[PDB]
Amino acid sequence: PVEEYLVHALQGSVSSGQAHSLASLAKTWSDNEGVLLTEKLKPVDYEYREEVHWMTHQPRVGRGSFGEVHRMKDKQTGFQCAVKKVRLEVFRVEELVACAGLSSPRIVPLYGAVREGPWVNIFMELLEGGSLGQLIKQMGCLPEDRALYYLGQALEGLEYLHTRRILHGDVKADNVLLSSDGSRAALCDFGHALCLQPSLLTGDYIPGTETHMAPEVVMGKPCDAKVDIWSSCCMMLHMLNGCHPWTQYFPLCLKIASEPPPIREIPPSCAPLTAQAIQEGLRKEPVHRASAMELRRKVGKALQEVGGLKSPWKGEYKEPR
Numbered sequence: 678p679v680e681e682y683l684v685h686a687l688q689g690s691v692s693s694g695q696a697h698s699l700a701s702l703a704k705t706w707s708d709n710e711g712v713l714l715t716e717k718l719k720p721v722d723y724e725y726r727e728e729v730h731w732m733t734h735q736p737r738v739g740r741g742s743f744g745e746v747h748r749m750k751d752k753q754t755g756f757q758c759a760v761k762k763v764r765l766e767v768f769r770v771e772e773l774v775a776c777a778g779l780s781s782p783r784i785v786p787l788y789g790a791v792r793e794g795p796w797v798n799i800f801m802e803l804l805e806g807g808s809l810g811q812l813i814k815q816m817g818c819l820p821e822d823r824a825l826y827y828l829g830q831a832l833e834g835l836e837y838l839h840t841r842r843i844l845h846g847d848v849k850a851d852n853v854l855l856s857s858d859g860s861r862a863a864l865c866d867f868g869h870a871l872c873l874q875p876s877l878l879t880g881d882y883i884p885g886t887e888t889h890m891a892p893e894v895v896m897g898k899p900c901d902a903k904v905d906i907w908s909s910c911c912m913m914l915h916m917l918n919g920c921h922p923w924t925q926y927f928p929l930c931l932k933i934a935s936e937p938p939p940i941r942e943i944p945p946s947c948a949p950l951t952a953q954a955i956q957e958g959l960r961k962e963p964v965h966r967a968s969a970m971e972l973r974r975k976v977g978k979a980l981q982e983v984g985g986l987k988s989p990w991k992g993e994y995k996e997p998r
């Protein structure tokens with residue numbers, strides 16, 4: 678009953694608010710209105726406008742697949758964070774729902790969201806360590822312990838999301854952001870996230886990366902939280918081999934469905950439990966594929982089996998396969 682009246686109060690203004698107000702106002706987005714969740718980003722006179730109240734850091738250095746993410750500063754408060762540009766006509770509410778109110782160290786925090794014309798500008802913490810993707814390119818590929826370390830932390834975040842019935846949708850190195858010392862990893866890019874109730878390829882849907890895509894998704898079978906696990910394992914392989922699965926050998930959605938899972942790419946010098954863990958996460962049938970909780974525990978043991986985390990965050994470059 679009153680829900681309709683609260684949406685109207687939030688519309689037309691940019692206000693200091695809480696995650697539940699942001700979520701309900703955002704559902705409408707699917708002229709300058711929005712909700713900011715921290716005092717570090719304050720509106721001025723019912724407004725928060727680009728280049729007036731907030732400034733992109735100069736010169737513009739983009740991050741993200743589309744160069745949509747930028748460093749920025751609140752002109753009033755001097756606080757700095759990141760902002761993701763989403764075209765308004767293609768905005769998806771699930772992106773914010775899947776990080777709004779969520780409070781987890783393995784998930785990047787949401788600072789707010791403000792519509793301005795054709796843009797939804799979404800604010801979030803700035804992480805200086807860059808993405809796991811940028812790391813893999815810098816180092817070439819990661820040692821076995823570092824890879825297990827990060828994979829587990831991603832799985833910790835996937836546990837959190839899955840408990841809340843949230844599919845991430847596009848898990849990969851580029852969507853894992855690292856702290857300035859490399860000891861913490863967080864998930865990012867919830868643009869493909871999907872609320873679940875205890876398939877995907879129907880209409881207003883944009884899917885994840887081809888190389889990390891699970892067979893059920895490819896063949897249009899029904900889908901659940903397990904697709905994140907498949908992707909996370911394809912990410913593990915990307916970490917170990919310095920390149921995506923299947924790219925050194927093959928029109929890639931054809932081969933995912935027909936061929937066996939890419940267990941061959943598991944490097945041979947890897948200890949038995951590392952390889953064994955990767956394999957439980959690359960079971961073609963969702964039923965036999967490991968859950969998040971299960972894999973995380975296995976990956977943790979695998980790390981323990983290999984002496985724990987010993988390699989430095991940025992050691993020597995290591996040539997890929």
Ligand SMILES: CN1C(=O)[C@](O)(C#Cc2cccc(-n3nc(C(N)=O)c4cccnc43)c2)[C@H]2C[C@H]21
Nearest residue numbers: 740741759786787801802803804808865866867
């Ligand atoms: C909370 N939240 C999200 O997670 C969110 O979906 C996002 C995102 C996203 C998409 C691409 C790139 C990056 N991205 N951001 C940083 C950074 N934060 O500095 C960064 C650094 C290196 C590489 N990519 C980076 C972040 C958005 C709803 C809000």
